[PDB]
Nucleic acid binder design. Sequence first.
DNA 1: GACCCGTGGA
DNA 2: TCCACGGGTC
Length: 280
Amino acid sequence: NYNPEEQFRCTIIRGKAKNMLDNLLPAYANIIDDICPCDKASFVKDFNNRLIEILGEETTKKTLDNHRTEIAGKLFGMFYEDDEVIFPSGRTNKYIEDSDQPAFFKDICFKFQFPNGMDKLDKVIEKVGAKIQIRQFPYILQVLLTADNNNIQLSKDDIAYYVLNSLQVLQGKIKPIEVIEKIIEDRSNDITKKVRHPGKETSYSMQHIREQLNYLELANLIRIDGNLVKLNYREAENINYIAQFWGNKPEFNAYKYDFTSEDDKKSFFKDWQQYYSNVN
DNA sequence: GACCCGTGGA
DNA sequence: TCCACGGGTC
């Protein structure tokens, strides 16, 4: 039944901190820890004024704002808002205590899901309309385990086409063994599949897929070795613990919100941040 | 009257 | 090839 030909582009936020992460993650965390708790006006000012010291004086305000909202706020879940005040998140609070970068990204991978409240509303509505519901990192790990069970290695293009851009997989309808069987079948017929979009550049098609893999690698659970994606079995216990959730519905239920209600829209994004960034 | 993603330096 | 600036488009 599994048909990967049903393709669906499903993004995550585009990164800004990979190259300089070892400097930027402490900066984000220390800025937030230092200036919070504070009101939103003070947060916006003081965060940008601190970050520009790190990124460089030519950095535009728009870039500073985008770091704050897209990466420190949404993708890395490092602060949240409650009662007009901005606070350091539980994830930040932990990192401030232990400086454990792999654990930071393991938590991100554990909690990530589609749909989520990182996306713009029109994209959320698109993903909900497509009945997307997946914990993608548990799923990827089980797919990699199953590939190893079967003595094959998967490429980034395999993960892209058959998992992270496959509608049926993103819908939570497919078992990892079905994916591996299909990949083995296509290979035997000399079929190599890649994600393609007409007239679009490779970043459009693949950057969010490569960057999802980057965060799994920063969590120390995989290695991207050239074209191939390989488990790090020095973390076999963690790999198996997280993989167990491959078939679980997302912990955060996007489907109980009425996105025509202004109150439910507000609740949705707030509730998402609480789930993703804090301890529950 | 803030994520998305074209675009190009690294 | 990788990935992030900053303009593009609740």
